[PDB]
Amino acid sequence: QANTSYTDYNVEANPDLFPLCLQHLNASFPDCASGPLSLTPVCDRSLSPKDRATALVSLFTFDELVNNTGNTGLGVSRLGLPNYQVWGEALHGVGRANFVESGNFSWATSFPMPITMMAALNKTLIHQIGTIVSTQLRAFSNAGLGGVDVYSPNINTFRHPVWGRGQETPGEDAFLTSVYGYEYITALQGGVDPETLKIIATAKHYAGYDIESWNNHSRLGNDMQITQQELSEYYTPPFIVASRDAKVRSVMCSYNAVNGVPSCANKFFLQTLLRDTFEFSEDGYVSGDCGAVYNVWNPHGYASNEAAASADSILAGTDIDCGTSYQWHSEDAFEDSLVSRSDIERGVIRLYSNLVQAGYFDGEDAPYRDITWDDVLSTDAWNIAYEAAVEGIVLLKNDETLPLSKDIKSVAVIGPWANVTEELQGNYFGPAPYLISPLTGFRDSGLDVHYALGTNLTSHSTSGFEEALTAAKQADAIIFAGGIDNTIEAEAMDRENITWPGNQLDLISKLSELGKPLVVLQMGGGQVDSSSLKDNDNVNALIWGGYPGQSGGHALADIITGKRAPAGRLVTTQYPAEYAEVFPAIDMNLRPNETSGNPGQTYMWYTGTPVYEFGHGLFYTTFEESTETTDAGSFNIQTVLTTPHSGYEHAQQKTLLNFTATVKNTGERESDYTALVYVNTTAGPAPYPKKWVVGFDRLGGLEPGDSQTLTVPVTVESVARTDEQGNRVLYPGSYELALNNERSVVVKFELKGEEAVILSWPEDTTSDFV
Amino acid sequence: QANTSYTDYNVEANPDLFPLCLQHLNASFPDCASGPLSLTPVCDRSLSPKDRATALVSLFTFDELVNNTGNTGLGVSRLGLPNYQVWGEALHGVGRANFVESGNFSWATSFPMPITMMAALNKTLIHQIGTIVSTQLRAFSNAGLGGVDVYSPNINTFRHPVWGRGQETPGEDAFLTSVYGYEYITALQGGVDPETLKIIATAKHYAGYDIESWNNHSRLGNDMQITQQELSEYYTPPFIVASRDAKVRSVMCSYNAVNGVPSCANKFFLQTLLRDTFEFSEDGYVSGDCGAVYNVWNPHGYASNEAAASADSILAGTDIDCGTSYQWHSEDAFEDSLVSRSDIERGVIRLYSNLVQAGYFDGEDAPYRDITWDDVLSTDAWNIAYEAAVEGIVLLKNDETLPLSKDIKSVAVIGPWANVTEELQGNYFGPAPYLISPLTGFRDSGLDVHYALGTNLTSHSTSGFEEALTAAKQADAIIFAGGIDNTIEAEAMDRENITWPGNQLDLISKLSELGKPLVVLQMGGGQVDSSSLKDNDNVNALIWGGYPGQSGGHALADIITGKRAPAGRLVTTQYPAEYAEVFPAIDMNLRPNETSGNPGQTYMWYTGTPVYEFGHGLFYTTFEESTETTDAGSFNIQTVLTTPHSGYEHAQQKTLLNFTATVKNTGERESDYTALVYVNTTAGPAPYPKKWVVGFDRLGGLEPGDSQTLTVPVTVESVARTDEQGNRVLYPGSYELALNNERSVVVKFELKGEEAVILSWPEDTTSDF
Numbered sequence A: 001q002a003n004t005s006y007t008d009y010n011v012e013a014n015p016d017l018f019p020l021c022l023q024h025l026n027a028s029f030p031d032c033a034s035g036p037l038s039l040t041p042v043c044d045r046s047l048s049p050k051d052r053a054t055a056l057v058s059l060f061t062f063d064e065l066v067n068n069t070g071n072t073g074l075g076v077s078r079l080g081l082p083n084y085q086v087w088g089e090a091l092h093g094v095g096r097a098n099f100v101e102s103g104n105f106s107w108a109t110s111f112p113m114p115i116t117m118m119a120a121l122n123k124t125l126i127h128q129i130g131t132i133v134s135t136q137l138r139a140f141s142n143a144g145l146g147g148v149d150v151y152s153p154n155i156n157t158f159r160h161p162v163w164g165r166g167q168e169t170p171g172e173d174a175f176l177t178s179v180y181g182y183e184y185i186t187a188l189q190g191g192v193d194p195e196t197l198k199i200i201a202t203a204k205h206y207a208g209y210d211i212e213s214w215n216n217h218s219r220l221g222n223d224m225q226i227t228q229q230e231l232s233e234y235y236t237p238p239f240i241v242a243s244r245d246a247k248v249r250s251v252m253c254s255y256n257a258v259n260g261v262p263s264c265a266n267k268f269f270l271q272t273l274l275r276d277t278f279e280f281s282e283d284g285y286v287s288g289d290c291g292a293v294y295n296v297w298n299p300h301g302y303a304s305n306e307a308a309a310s311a312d313s314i315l316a317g318t319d320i321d322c323g324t325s326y327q328w329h330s331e332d333a334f335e336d337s338l339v340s341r342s343d344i345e346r347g348v349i350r351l352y353s354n355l356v357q358a359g360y361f362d363g364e365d366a367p368y369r370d371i372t373w374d375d376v377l378s379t380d381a382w383n384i385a386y387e388a389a390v391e392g393i394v395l396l397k398n399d400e401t402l403p404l405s406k407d408i409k410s411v412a413v414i415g416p417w418a419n420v421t422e423e424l425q426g427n428y429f430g431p432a433p434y435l436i437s438p439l440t441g442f443r444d445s446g447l448d449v450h451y452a453l454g455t456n457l458t459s460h461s462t463s464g465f466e467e468a469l470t471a472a473k474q475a476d477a478i479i480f481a482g483g484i485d486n487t488i489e490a491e492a493m494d495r496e497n498i499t500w501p502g503n504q505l506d507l508i509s510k511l512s513e514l515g516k517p518l519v520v521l522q523m524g525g526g527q528v529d530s531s532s533l534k535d536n537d538n539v540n541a542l543i544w545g546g547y548p549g550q551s552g553g554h555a556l557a558d559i560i561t562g563k564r565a566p567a568g569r570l571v572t573t574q575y576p577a578e579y580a581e582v583f584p585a586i587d588m589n590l591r592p593n594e595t596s597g598n599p600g601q602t603y604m605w606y607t608g609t610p611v612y613e614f615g616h617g618l619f620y621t622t623f624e625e626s627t628e629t630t631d632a633g634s635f636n637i638q639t640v641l642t643t644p645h646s647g648y649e650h651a652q653q654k655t656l657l658n659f660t661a662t663v664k665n666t667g668e669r670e671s672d673y674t675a676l677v678y679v680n681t682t683a684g685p686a687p688y689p690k691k692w693v694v695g696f697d698r699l700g701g702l703e704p705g706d707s708q709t710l711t712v713p714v715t716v717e718s719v720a721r722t723d724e725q726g727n728r729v730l731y732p733g734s735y736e737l738a739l740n741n742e743r744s745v746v747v748k749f750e751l752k753g754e755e756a757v758i759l760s761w762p763e764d765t766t767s768d769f770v
Numbered sequence B: 001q002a003n004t005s006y007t008d009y010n011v012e013a014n015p016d017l018f019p020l021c022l023q024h025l026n027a028s029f030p031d032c033a034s035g036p037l038s039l040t041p042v043c044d045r046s047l048s049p050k051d052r053a054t055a056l057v058s059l060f061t062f063d064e065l066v067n068n069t070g071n072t073g074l075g076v077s078r079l080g081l082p083n084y085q086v087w088g089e090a091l092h093g094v095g096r097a098n099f100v101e102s103g104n105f106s107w108a109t110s111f112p113m114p115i116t117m118m119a120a121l122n123k124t125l126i127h128q129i130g131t132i133v134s135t136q137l138r139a140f141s142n143a144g145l146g147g148v149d150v151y152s153p154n155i156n157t158f159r160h161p162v163w164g165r166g167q168e169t170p171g172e173d174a175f176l177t178s179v180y181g182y183e184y185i186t187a188l189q190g191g192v193d194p195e196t197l198k199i200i201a202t203a204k205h206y207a208g209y210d211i212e213s214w215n216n217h218s219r220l221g222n223d224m225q226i227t228q229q230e231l232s233e234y235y236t237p238p239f240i241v242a243s244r245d246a247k248v249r250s251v252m253c254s255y256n257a258v259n260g261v262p263s264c265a266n267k268f269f270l271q272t273l274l275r276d277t278f279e280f281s282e283d284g285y286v287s288g289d290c291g292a293v294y295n296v297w298n299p300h301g302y303a304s305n306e307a308a309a310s311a312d313s314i315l316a317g318t319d320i321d322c323g324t325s326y327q328w329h330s331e332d333a334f335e336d337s338l339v340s341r342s343d344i345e346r347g348v349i350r351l352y353s354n355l356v357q358a359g360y361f362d363g364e365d366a367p368y369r370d371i372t373w374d375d376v377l378s379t380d381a382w383n384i385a386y387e388a389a390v391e392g393i394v395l396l397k398n399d400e401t402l403p404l405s406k407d408i409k410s411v412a413v414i415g416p417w418a419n420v421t422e423e424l425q426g427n428y429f430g431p432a433p434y435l436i437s438p439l440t441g442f443r444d445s446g447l448d449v450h451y452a453l454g455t456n457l458t459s460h461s462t463s464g465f466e467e468a469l470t471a472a473k474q475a476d477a478i479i480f481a482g483g484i485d486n487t488i489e490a491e492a493m494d495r496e497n498i499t500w501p502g503n504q505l506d507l508i509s510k511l512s513e514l515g516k517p518l519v520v521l522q523m524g525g526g527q528v529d530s531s532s533l534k535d536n537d538n539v540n541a542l543i544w545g546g547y548p549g550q551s552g553g554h555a556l557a558d559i560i561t562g563k564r565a566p567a568g569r570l571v572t573t574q575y576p577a578e579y580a581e582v583f584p585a586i587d588m589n590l591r592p593n594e595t596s597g598n599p600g601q602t603y604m605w606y607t608g609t610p611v612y613e614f615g616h617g618l619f620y621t622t623f624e625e626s627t628e629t630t631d632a633g634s635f636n637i638q639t640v641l642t643t644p645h646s647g648y649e650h651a652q653q654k655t656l657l658n659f660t661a662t663v664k665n666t667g668e669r670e671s672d673y674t675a676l677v678y679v680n681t682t683a684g685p686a687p688y689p690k691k692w693v694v695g696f697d698r699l700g701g702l703e704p705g706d707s708q709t710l711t712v713p714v715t716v717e718s719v720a721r722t723d724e725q726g727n728r729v730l731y732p733g734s735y736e737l738a739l740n741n742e743r744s745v746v747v748k749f750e751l752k753g754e755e756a757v758i759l760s761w762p763e764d765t766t767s768d769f
């Protein structure tokens, strides 16, 4: 929109936002002691948030209202209503506060990227970080340096491995992504629909958004063809969970179209589904992605101008425009009879319902108003970012090499990922209090370190090889830190392949033939084809370290030297190179279609051979896994569904059966243990998924000898499939619960009865209406 | 459904309900101090109503749930949750309580029917009557004799004059019907979205329902074709006001289909309009009219069986089935996977959200739990039934004959409405504490009475004629009491004509030839063609008495003797009889169409010549009417909508300007004065309405020589029209506010600027899918 020359947003993946949208605002709180509003209903603490918000907007002139239909809410000086910035970010720590150059509020804790947080498979870990981010976010708010709402979390799934933003997500599995959303949102908002909101959270991006730019398919003009079945079974569950169970107070609509219609002008998505089917809060508000309302016009061409795009987005259910479409066109839209003042007011009343519920009109004694810089120091000082990295690092391969022998007194650190700063933080990060590179990790672990760059991330020169080989000879063992970073994968930048970049592999190879202990760190969010490192016996060890944040190097060093043990596991498939070549990344169809070239997408449908599988992880010890009841027997569907469901809003929310096992440490070392429980079945229509996650746990501190019992509730909804109309359906038949990919322990069960619908999928009568 | 032989419900207008549906239930309160629920969250006053109802429904087995999806909620004995009857009535007093044979709770105050109540043009009276009914209803509830929800009020409009149930409505105008609704509902529920619901009210019948059976066109199979424009402009505004302004907790969906879809299976009506456009409470429930859900299958044929009809109605938004469709066919629907459990629980949670907010779970100490029979006696003592009748009686013709001259000491009371009991009460009525005939009216008034039946209401016989004529001659003045009653107009029974029944006119005529003073009383809800009474100069006076309730007699006599002066006005048109002959009554098109024979419907569109007019009424006195400013001047549409609207949810709720007159009693008798304020315009699209009510009021006790300020807020929204797509639009152009039908006072104003939309009307994507 603010382009200075012709820009084709069918190909360009970054909008040109006007400065008003990008303007950071100085936060203050309205005054209900003596300001113009003190004697009005908005300051009456005995009325609902909706009545108080409604009374507030009633005072505005139209000009003042429109100034507050955008993310950069300019306020109303006349009523002592401050400017308010809706655009906050908390992907993995405070992301978009008004950071001071130095001193107080110059940094906030930078936790690992979500792709790495999820790998820990510790639902409590995700919760605890949210609580920490939530507190730091409040410290910034209370020093007038931020809002009380953030555009987090990303609960899209890493469907296709090229996605430049898959690093922001809890991986390719809807079940794990759902649980991520629930724990983070409940942590951000300060409880399950609680009396006072701590921080207003925002599930993004709703929906069908999992491509930036692959082969010039710009997110801003993408129209994704998705079946009601896959929309229901895959693309929306995390949103259903955020909306229905986490009681998320906000949803951001995506840039893309789905079945002809941009998300933010999509009645079916916003009204029929989110509002009429997923029980989105009565007072909840929808925010456009920055520029998304403009995109309904340019380049989707769903609306013929920015005034019609504004009208179509408001009438569909987009409450706040991240952008300048509402602010600069909602007046045109009104004068052209495209919307009513009441339409434009609906979005603002909803926003301020949430701010009232966050104590915004309640003065200095309100909840959370007492949080200071000292709470950022104290919460950071817990070093949960270190802990998070230590739990989330994944061992893909090991032959006794790790941990490092008593013998190894010196070690050669090599590769483009050894000497790094902000590479640790992935994206949507704020200034961190420090950044410990892997190099600085090993120096601090007290081994003699010999550094050599060797190669740059995307180099074809051998210039650096000589110096690296000679450093590797000096030393007792080789740590090679390579992979990808945001120079390869970022927002507006999908990968065009899923292979290691440059000549990093060529260098790892030469280091293999030196009879030296060779450890490879594969870093980045997306997965790279490590097939060559798999079937090469001289590469001893392989670690996926994702994006491990402010203390990543202490974490990686401490895993390697065995000061801590790894238990993390992959939360995406590592596909072979050819996967990214054989069918287009903008084909949303998950089910294998031989005619098209689609081998089926995600662990659930893929009919080729992963290099490393979704769920794959290793430990510095061995586990004996087994169970009391290895056939939990039959259950009647009509019986399960027709008993009381005391404690649950929905019958299908109940535990169908526990998955139980015993897990004994039968190896050298103390360690944590992670489990991912899958189901598979021939129940329901063909085709059939291979398996699908229905739970996960992390057991802690298993000394050798020690046993702990793993207990994973399989809920009724978790084993239901989905029909051709999108209804979630319990089908009768034969089911197996398998522990990890090796199927350590198998509990079988039969669903007896007739089919039952547990969620009715509304018909889409609006998308293609004439 | 419960028919013992074939019944064609396309012609038969009464459903055959199974007894479970018709069963009265012994009301009681769950025990949150001691019962099974005491330990559960439904008994926790920290939580919202929705969280409590939800927790409650979470304890049920499916079977128990399914048993509580119909009006006759059989309860859950396992949790000590009593049976609960959703089917209460309070059209114009307590109507479906478990009345006892005699003693305490054997009657309730029976007010005049709504059609007369409205003719008073006293919105305060409508509110006070509703507060009394609310108090009496809670007295019945506290005694274990009724629920805390009622299927009231009827805010359909008396669109066509043959309608059997127009008697139940505030007449043919959408504005008056809106205000009636707002005042009755806010009175029933005990405020505007109050902390504790007094009585849950139910706006009916939504929507497009204003025919029973005319020409064998049965309400149960009628598929009415309505334009989005007229659906938005005429047929839904009272429901908009009930939902958005009064905050009604319940809405009844109608028996009929509109544009191919039964209302209780109408997603457009229940979700897109009522829930997504009209701001219906997020805890509000939709009740089906008794049988309506069955009717989706038989005879509409929208569903192909009663399980499918049940599924289709739950998924549209019909929460509670008055009937046995849900109770007996929900399981078949669930097992044939037409609905989830969760779909079936949605409706019951909504109902129980409302019962939680009515204090149903909060024990003996909650608000309204202390009301007793004592409170029925005192509210009835106030005699608002009598006041209401006095304010609602409409004087049509008069030549000074009325009031009755001090001379006249004896009177011949004649006609079929003279000696009556339950005719005073119209329909949907419980037992009265007493019923005062017109005949009893005159005996009590002190005059000597000469009663003669003359003729029966519907009669081909001259048998009683001579006896009546004798009574007349042997007396100073003749009072004829005639018209229609619920033997002509009732539920399931439209009229087939709009003319006086039998030979009442033939007899009235002969009574006029005796040159004694002759006063005529046209009774009933429907108007009846009195052109022959107008033109007959020997008919001194003509009164419309409607259905004046328990004290109708004392009201009519006190008006006629002059112990009280009338002020009421018709709230329907009195059409010529040909009106019911030229076009089919099933045509919903309000605008005149010359190709179809449609002269236009109601005062707003009627091209013909009413016998008497919507708003017509006379006083026992004369009035001088004037205003300082006859040109209010110019208002810019954009200016009016772009300023603050402090105190109002929507900008359009703001007063555009006050219509403002001076009214002086220039006659010999004290009177109340009633004003209807009409707008007419050349703005917006063609055709143009003749006019439409934007306001009304009634001023009290104007003694002769006294003057009073008439001040009627004219709201921005009340002068907005409606485009071809159904949008509510303020149009720029020329406007005039006229006082009463003679336009005693005309105030001009002009709307300048561009067309603004004040209500975006959603597109119907689901009806034709």
Ligand SMILES: *[C@@H]1O[C@H](CO)[C@@H](O[C@@H]2O[C@H](CO)[C@@H](O[C@@H]3O[C@H](CO[C@H]4O[C@H](CO[C@H]5O[C@H](CO)[C@@H](O)[C@H](O)[C@@H]5O[C@H]5O[C@H](CO)[C@@H](O)[C@H](O)[C@@H]5O)[C@@H](O)[C@H](O[C@H]5O[C@H](CO)[C@@H](O)[C@H](O)[C@@H]5O)[C@@H]4O)[C@@H](O)[C@H](O[C@H]4O[C@H](CO)[C@@H](O)[C@H](O)[C@@H]4O[C@H]4O[C@H](CO)[C@@H](O)[C@H](O)[C@@H]4O)[C@@H]3O)[C@H](O)[C@H]2NC(C)=O)[C@H](O)[C@H]1NC(C)=O
Binding pocket: A122, A124, A125, A126, A128, A129, A131, A132, A135, A379, A381, A382, A383, A384, A387, A391, A672, A698, A699, A700
């Ligand atoms: C899965 O993930 C889990 C979640 O992350 C993980 O559990 C956590 O493990 C970590 C790492 O081992 C623990 O971290 C230590 O915590 C010590 C302080 O502990 C006390 O406070 C904690 C935080 O409490 C807040 O959050 C709770 C959880 O939501 C709330 O319920 C609390 O009310 C509280 O909230 C407050 O703040 C919030 C955010 O600001 C805010 O929302 C809220 O309103 C309120 O203001 C508690 O969690 C903890 O509770 C544990 O222990 C108690 C008993 O003490 C039990 O009753 C509990 O059940 C629970 O088990 C405590 O109350 C820190 O002292 C410690 O830091 C020191 O050591 C680290 C090394 O790790 C150093 O880097 C650091 O600098 C510190 O060193 C300094 O002090 C030491 C003193 O020993 C000294 O040696 C040194 O010289 C130096 O001076 C560390 O951060 C964390 O406590 C665990 N929390 C929870 C809840 O689980 C779990 O292990 C993982 N499990 C698996 C299977 O992987």
Ligand SMILES: *[C@@H]1O[C@H](CO)[C@@H](O[C@@H]2O[C@H](CO)[C@@H](O)[C@H](O)[C@H]2NC(C)=O)[C@H](O)[C@H]1NC(C)=O
Binding pocket: B680, B681, B682, B734, B735, B736, B743
């Ligand atoms: C509103 O209605 C009145 C009728 O009450 C209209 O009055 C007519 O006006 C024209 C020109 O002003 C006169 O020549 C006619 O004699 C009037 N007719 C009658 C029957 O009074 C008036 O035009 C209408 N106003 C608008 C703005 O449409």
Ligand SMILES: *[C@@H]1O[C@H](CO)[C@@H](O)[C@H](O)[C@H]1NC(C)=O
Binding pocket: A001, A003, A004, A005, A006, A007, A008, A009, A298
């Ligand atoms: C910006 O790009 C658009 C095409 O998306 C083009 O229509 C417009 O002219 C460009 N604006 C400027 C100022 O170059």
Ligand SMILES: *[C@@H]1O[C@H](CO)[C@@H](O)[C@H](O)[C@H]1NC(C)=O
Binding pocket: A023, A024, A025, A026
């Ligand atoms: C915020 O405050 C700073 C420091 O006083 C000031 O310089 C700046 O202009 C203010 N920002 C805005 C957007 O007004």
Ligand SMILES: *[C@@H]1O[C@H](CO)[C@@H](O)[C@H](O)[C@H]1NC(C)=O
Binding pocket: A020, A063, A064, A067, A074
């Ligand atoms: C709206 O915002 C603009 C700046 O973008 C400002 O100049 C203007 O004063 C504001 N309008 C009103 C009426 O406050």
Ligand SMILES: *[C@@H]1O[C@H](CO)[C@@H](O)[C@H](O)[C@H]1NC(C)=O
Binding pocket: A104, A373, A374, A377
């Ligand atoms: C910075 O925060 C600290 C809390 O550790 C506080 O002592 C100090 O006053 C703050 N400094 C300023 C200049 O606000």
Ligand SMILES: *[C@@H]1O[C@H](CO)[C@@H](O)[C@H](O)[C@H]1NC(C)=O
Binding pocket: A419, A420, A421, A451
């Ligand atoms: C490592 O990176 C830093 C920071 O970008 C750089 O200044 C330094 O020269 C690099 N080299 C070594 C050997 O650390």
Ligand SMILES: *[C@@H]1O[C@H](CO)[C@@H](O)[C@H](O)[C@H]1NC(C)=O
Binding pocket: A453, A454, A455, A456, A459, A461, A463, A464
């Ligand atoms: C790596 O990149 C840096 C920055 O461009 C460059 O100066 C350096 O020489 C490169 N090193 C090698 C070994 O190519």
Ligand SMILES: *[C@@H]1O[C@H](CO)[C@@H](O)[C@H](O)[C@H]1NC(C)=O
Binding pocket: A589, A593, A595, A596
């Ligand atoms: C499979 O691919 C072919 C060609 O792309 C397509 O016509 C067919 O409909 C696809 N099947 C499905 C289930 O989409």
Ligand SMILES: *[C@@H]1O[C@H](CO)[C@@H](O)[C@H](O)[C@H]1NC(C)=O
Binding pocket: A655, A656, A657, A658, A711, A713
């Ligand atoms: C499942 O396990 C939980 C946790 O121990 C237990 O409370 C519950 O009774 C078990 N439910 C079933 C269905 O076995």
Ligand SMILES: *[C@@H]1O[C@H](CO)[C@@H](O)[C@H](O)[C@H]1NC(C)=O
Binding pocket: A680, A681, A682, A734, A735, A736, A743
């Ligand atoms: C599930 O998969 C296992 C192996 O993964 C297979 O042997 C078994 O037959 C499958 N069970 C069902 C119910 O499909």
Ligand SMILES: *[C@@H]1O[C@H](CO)[C@@H](O)[C@H](O)[C@H]1NC(C)=O
Binding pocket: B001, B003, B004, B005, B006, B007, B008, B009, B298
């Ligand atoms: C009742 O009427 C219906 C149709 O209206 C008919 O199908 C049914 O057979 C009748 N039932 C009995 C017992 O006659």
Ligand SMILES: *[C@@H]1O[C@H](CO)[C@@H](O)[C@H](O)[C@H]1NC(C)=O
Binding pocket: B023, B024, B025, B026
């Ligand atoms: C209501 O109570 C009466 C008197 O005890 C009893 O005869 C009657 O059966 C009860 N009604 C029901 C429907 O159980």
Ligand SMILES: *[C@@H]1O[C@H](CO)[C@@H](O)[C@H](O)[C@H]1NC(C)=O
Binding pocket: B020, B063, B064, B067, B074, B076
């Ligand atoms: C449902 O209602 C029937 C009466 O129509 C009754 O026999 C039965 O007890 C009820 N079922 C349950 C589970 O309460």
Ligand SMILES: *[C@@H]1O[C@H](CO)[C@@H](O)[C@H](O)[C@H]1NC(C)=O
Binding pocket: B011, B215, B216
């Ligand atoms: C109505 O139906 C009856 C039989 O039910 C029939 O005899 C009569 O002719 C019909 N009447 C009209 C006015 O169409």
Ligand SMILES: *[C@@H]1O[C@H](CO)[C@@H](O)[C@H](O)[C@H]1NC(C)=O
Binding pocket: B104, B373, B374
């Ligand atoms: C009837 O109501 C009166 C009101 O005063 C009360 O005293 C009396 O106790 C009641 N009678 C019965 C039998 O409840």
